[PDB]
């Protein structure tokens, strides 16, 4: 199981890596939006997805914390 636990641990870790990646690109999308916005429904679509994506990140963060707990058991 030790080697078994190893792979799953690097999968769980890799998922955390990906999530932080996704969060970091969010910070960047927000900036590009700000930039664009310094220069209609477009603003509406932006908010609909921004909310959606902040929603999905939260869920993932939560699921990440549970997967790491079930792995530590």
């Amino acid at each position: 199981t030790v080697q078994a636990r190893q792979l799953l641990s690097g999968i769980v870790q890799q998922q955390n890596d990906l999530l932080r990646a996704i969060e970091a690109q969010q910070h960047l999308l927000q900036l590009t939006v700000w930039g664009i916005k310094q220069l209609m429904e477009w603003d509406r679509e932006i908010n609909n997805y921004t909310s959606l994506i902040h929603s999905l990140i939260e869920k993932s963060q939560n699921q990440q914390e549970k997967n790491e707990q079930e792995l530590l058991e």
Copy 2:
């Protein structure tokens, strides 16, 4: 195995969470492109990667559906 199935199920779920996150940031990138585009090769690079990324999302969506089936077995 029940607890074993549990972790893998939250990993599979987390992967779905990440994919939808990635898709939602795509909707947002498309919008920022539109925004930018309301104001050369740049347009070419945009299309090359847009296609690439829609390609990768499709594959992932497919692989997500298979991982969820192999887990339900």
Copy 3:
């Protein structure tokens, strides 16, 4: 184990799919930044996160290579 190895292999694969997705959206964020930039601290925040995100992609790429090796064992 064969079926056991199967799921984990599609999870590892799915993670690669997601990473390449994330990298492809990076190429696109860079382009939208360039676009925006053709037209203050904003430039600083851009670099801080760009670095951060290139950092996270590297780590993930490395972790992807290890997970695929531990799975091939």
